[PDB]
Assembly symmetry: D2
Homo-oligomer: 460 residues x 4
């Protein structure tokens, strides 16, 4: 005998599965009694979450608006079209010059879909090296020559690097490598680069070697929407992005592509739109995740607001303020500052590896990540998440105090037990000094609001 | 200018922050329960799944595997994901020493393309059930004119096998013939519109004869598999990929199962799938997992192990059967003459109709079917029972669905005979057709008599 | 102190290196005191050999006539142009409709060069299966899936087969496989197919699936020159060939390609010529072997002669006569006859493998090769070489006697020692019956003239 | 109609069977010895090599390896080929337990492309000396515009390294930098117009640092290598490919050498090259061996181990040096300022001339050089000593060659200044130029004073 629809289909989660209910509540507390400094993380809005957990997940809508494989998409179409037009509006794009596909399941899929549209297998790609701040999806093989990223498995990648002493992109060595190697695609954009991008220069290099130019703006998408950093849309043929980082929406990706007539350089037009959409479906993805697309549409509307431009401005200023704080304490920052949402902290001068600081920090509910510079010798630290919780400059200056205390403890433990990791671990067991910091982090964290859910009704 | 307070942008309900989207979701809530959904790939998932899906799990970055993440703060995400992985084994009755699972694929197509990347180099050969015979795009697809459509045919080398051109069953003899000519590294079984069960043992026989891996993509029938109501592919397959949002009734995600442990006989060797598969998902293809999806999936998998889910699985079968026997009783033709799973494939060419015309008119009566190919424009339509069975429909109610479809096809032929075969002509008969209106209205009245999972009809804006 | 030019540069081979001199003399005797039935072998003319061993080997002439990379090619150019025009004349081709490149070093290179001109790596190719009579260069992988032929390593090949009971090409299963698999290139022509080729049908199949059609006529090239078999030039886009088989020239290859306007099927022309020449040089080969090209030009002139049409006619008739002889003794021929230079002898009916007959035959200076049918169950037997020595029908009927005696001895040994190869070997040691046959072969072989050198001045 | 008798078609000499070709060979015999051949890749081989080359060895089919042929009748071909293989090891002083050789390549480019197929999968990465810096097409070559020209760049993934842009030497630091960015599976050393020796130990250092195989293509300097007059690549390279018709003075063929036996230190492992290389030649790429070439090569290899060949090798070096020092003494510029092998590379841009104009005028005086690139139309010409040294020329005679070239370049500038830089203009000065005639005639008079290998001048038709 079948369970009545009420019993299995309508009963709240807290009853259907306490185990998972209880774990979600514990993660809810973790997100708001710690200090979240992972530069790729944010806290999204309750509205976005409601769209995300909606009946839109039940619908199959392979294809795209007006070219669907089967019917019943009368309202999905308005949602997707509404999502696409808000995407253009949030980045101030004329619709006669740009289009967007909002179906990619996430960032990595968007990237691989766009490659598939414009490149044949084994075509050459250049992206920012991982160790110089790049991303897996831009290409990565190891020193042994094992191909790690699918970009490196299905295409041929070669990375360009930052200057070995300044930490800035080396635009001359870039140009040099593009002309030896002759990539069909140059990727700009990164995961841990703390400075803005000279897209005009990348366009100078791409025209010199015959390449397409793609920007992957996942990290700074929110800053781009507020016109708070250089717009890659002025110079690139394609822009990919994530929607859950500085943009503060759901986890999803977007591909923006040029349309209309070519800037004279004959009398032809761009041919990206059909190749891009087709690469997404039917080539690479199945049915779009329409709950994600609804949520994104909500996030794109929020992202166009005056309140969101102030958020973007405040993200940059918080990162600067934390940056100037660390430097005033003697600490080294890659490029000696920041122009975007993150700072890159160089720990080799102190004799420390990124692993050791990130472990002790994690012990105090400060989440950072180890990260390469120029074992990883640094940590990446971002402003968006905590800024979304309403922290301003005085507050990030205090986060800086917390970090400074962590590294001190880290040096004191290294000074007492040794440089090897087996030795560093020995001084984490029942450290009364680490405890005192975890408590001070928790009390500081509880002074702030939290978007997405109500802290006044959570189980813990 | 100042920052918006957290309560204003971040806690305010969706209905205030964005009326337009709230409105459109409410309209689509109405469409889902005032019509008849018969897309074989569609289901209606539980409110408990949707609560996990719309949750704060979407803020966490957890690149990696439980226990081996890239950065910290994953104490509870590792628990949710491990719970999910252990429940995926339970729901399909797998010994934890012979099978593992990766639950990170964003969807079904990502799970397939990751599975291939793990066990194949680029351009390796693949065989899957042809699209025209009931297969799926991710199993390989180029057109007559040579154009490579599926990613699987772009980065690997595919060649399809077909059903018997007169009976509609998989032609197992011709499968073996092609696999020995072509020598694929991977054979795929499973499909999107195949109305019979699969002979996995036979597929294992062919894979062992030509030296291929055997992968079953069980997306469509995964819920029937969990309930042990169809043949299990785990008895014979090396890898089993699946979607979780069809007959499984979960969120939109995918999973990849792999054999692990010792192999029956090249000396005491063991399966090596585990590492290559997890690594193919991350870091090779995917980025951060979608943790809300993994929590929602963990919910669905627990629900999928409950005694009521077995009853649900039996019922979708019986509902598909009853509808099949009802249609044939009215004189219609079904590919292979019936069904043994969740769907029926309806051959319309005997009526001189295209699946196009039937799908269009049905949609105008709130009946969602999709046009579909038959062994030989699409000459059929595909019809599935999971969704409507999830709303409580039993056999008597699917015989009423069959009566509606009959009325629909009768409307279609009366339009064809009146205006012509041309699709220009056909559409003329769909304007102001009071006979269609009475059917759309008879459909909506039937539809309202049954409950609805996921939300509360008593709370909807449009009643 | 340098050796004078006379001492090292002009001294005859018999003095500079007796070892090699002596081995060449022993191979000279072997070629004219045996019975050479390898269908791919011939005996070429003294004139061709003189061109082959000429000062033309010292010249570097990268490029082609009138487009050379450097000078001094005033006479090489006339030789190559003379070679190309004789190539067209020997196969009755209008020069406004066909061109030829005569630079490929041999057959396999010609084939791989032509693939390279018209296909991209991994494009799909269909060729006659090896076991059905095809050639390595048309595509070959093993049952384990190891790629053997470079055609299978750098492109994707799938073989079409002969009918499992008649041994003829299965033109219906051919068409079926081309439409599933969709090759960009279909190869026709073979190494051991004893019947003519329905090129019109192959053209019907290639137009149905969008493929180029190439014929590899290496084995029957001489028969084509005499218009003694169907011309592939009526129906194919490209024809490759060897020049040392039935054509009786030096070891080298040629690529013929269509030129001029397309047969209407708009108003465009063929684009093979530049791609083909470019694939040969600079893509695949270095300097052409100008001694080979001189020799080929000599062979092409000989190949146009009335004496050579009679040779081609006589090759076919000899193979028929040997064919009808074996069959009159009860033996099975694949397709029950032959229309070209070879017969394929099916030995499974007698309970024998091709290995065993070819070993005993080799013991009597009868050279044949084991070969697959439909361990290999057959032997391939060709007429050209012995026909070039002037054997006519009565003489090949006698060769048939020799073969019949060999198989009898082979059955008698199998009947006495066993079916396994370890057992068959046991009865080859000091077999007085095999000796009597080797002697009868030698005395028969000495009754005939020999081209290429003078038997009246050889060391042995 | 009847068959021509064997004596008529098959035994009649070339001069009767085909006057046209006989005539043209005789004219080309005359060109070869009444001019000055300075193509660095050209030589004049011995009559004994040519007798093996034009022999009945061309009738035999011997697909396979000695001992492991496809069909019989190869008793003496296996002996010739084994003799040839053993002499190839002797001529380069290789221990038979550490090195093997395959002598079946039809030419140099086939030997290279077979070597790659044996040790690399398709699309694996390769680094070779750039064309513009002195490398060879088979080492990889795409143009600025992206066009893939070399087969090596079509089926594999190549990237060139370059000479130092001011000194002309290989830039070993930038080589190491690129190889660590690009991670090739194979590094190639050797070239076609590099005037210095190679630092194989350095190349081995880079290959070991980035984990690549190291192959030396020694085509140009193989004769100098056999004579131990330049650095041996066998000390450091895994595989050594070569042509046999340049400084080696053999027929047109190639060879591939491979290391075999134990490797110095991943535990007591051994080299695995032998099988993959022979199999790559046959059956993967080539068909029947050209046995006349293998016999002719066996002759050249014996001759190449004689004491006179060492004296010849020393002399080509000294001849190239003397010509280099003579040219510089007249004010000319040589890339890297001299030579340590068989050739000089002459930078003409300092005179405002293109290699085109010099090569054209030289050809009109029976002086064969080839235009060639320099570190930065080709701005240089390449000039080689092997050929003319083979005719007995020593230093005094190469200083006379230098005097002729000087006269040639002086004629060229006097034409440039008179008519202009335009190649339209330039050609105007080449018609009825009695100063060129006196130089063409002074050249032909010089040329006749020296003997000639391969044939007998006293027997030629055109004297
Ligand atoms: C058999 C099969 N496998 C995989 C997938 C991929 O699912 P995703 O959309 O999650 O990528 C599908 C899609 N099923 C679509 C249909 O039959 O209507 C499928 O039918
Ligand atoms: C620059 C960039 N591009 C794309 C992505 C892909 O995102 P998905 O997880 O949605 O696939 C990332 C991930 N950024 C992860 C981090 O920096 O921690 C990224 O940093
Ligand atoms: C270094 C090098 N390697 C290989 C080859 C190939 O040789 P084949 O032509 O046999 O394929 C050449 C040709 N040398 C031509 C020149 O330098 O003028 C070469 O210079
Ligand atoms: C049909 C065919 N095509 C091409 C070739 C290549 O020839 P080369 O050896 O010149 O590469 C062969 C060799 N025929 C060999 C045999 O049948 O014994 C052949 O049979």
């Amino acid at each position: 005998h079948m369970d009545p629809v009420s019993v299995w289909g309508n009963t709240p989660l807290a009853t259907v599965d306490p185990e998972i209910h209880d774990l979600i509540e514990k993660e809810k507390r973790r997100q708001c009694r710690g200090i979240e400094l992972i530069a790729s993380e944010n806290f999204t809005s309750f509205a976005v979450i409601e769209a995300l957990g909606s009946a839109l997940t039940n619908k199959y809508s392979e294809g795209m608006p007006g070219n669907r494989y089967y019917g019943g998409n009368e309202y999905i179409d308005q949602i997707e079209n509404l999502c696409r037009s808000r995407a253009l509006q949030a980045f101030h794009l004329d619709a006669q010059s740009w289009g967007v596909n909002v179906q990619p399941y996430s960032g990595s899929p968007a990237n691989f879909a766009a490659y598939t549209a414009v490149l044949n297998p084994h075509d050459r790609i250049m992206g920012l090296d991982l160790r110089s701040g790049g991303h897996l999806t831009h290409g990565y093989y190891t020193s042994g020559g094992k191909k790690i990223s699918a970009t490196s498995i299905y295409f041929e990648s070669l990375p360009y690097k930052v200057n070995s002493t300044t930490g800035y992109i080396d635009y001359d060595r870039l140009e040099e490598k593009a002309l030896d190697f002759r990539p069909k695609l140059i990727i700009c954009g990164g995961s841990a680069y703390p400075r803005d991008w000279d897209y005009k220069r990348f366009r100078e290099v791409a025209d010199k070697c015959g390449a397409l130019l793609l920007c992957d703006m996942a990290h700074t998408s929110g800053l781009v929407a507020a016109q708070e950093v250089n717009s890659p849309f002025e110079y690139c043929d394609i822009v990919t992005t994530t929607t859950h980082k500085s943009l503060r929406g759901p986890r999803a990706g977007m591909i923006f592509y040029r349309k209309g007539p070519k800037p004279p350089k004959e009398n032809a037009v761009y041919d990206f739109e059909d190749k891009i959409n087709f690469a997404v479906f039917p080539s690479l993805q199945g049915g779009p995740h329409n709950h994600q697309i609804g949520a994104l549409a909500v996030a794109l509307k929020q992202a166009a607001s005056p309140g969101f431009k102030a958020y973007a401005k405040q993200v940059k200023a918080n990162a600067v303020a934390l940056g100037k704080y660390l430097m005033g304490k003697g600490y080294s920052l890659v490029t000696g500052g920041t122009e975007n949402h993150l700072v890159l902290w160089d720990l080799r001068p102190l004799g420390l590896t990124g692993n050791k600081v990130e472990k002790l920090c994690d012990l105090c509910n400060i989440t950072v990540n180890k990260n390469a510079v120029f074992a990883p010798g640094g940590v990446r630290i971002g402003a968006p998440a905590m800024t979304s919780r309403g922290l301003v400059e005085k507050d990030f200056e205090q986060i800086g105090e917390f970090l400074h205390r962590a590294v001190t403890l880290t040096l004191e433990i290294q000074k007492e037990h040794g440089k090897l990791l087996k030795d560093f671990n020995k001084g984490l067991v029942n450290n009364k000094a680490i405890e005192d910091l975890k408590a001070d982090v928790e009390k500081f964290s509880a002074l702030f609001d939290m978007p997405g859910f109500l802290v006044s009704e959570m189980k813990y």
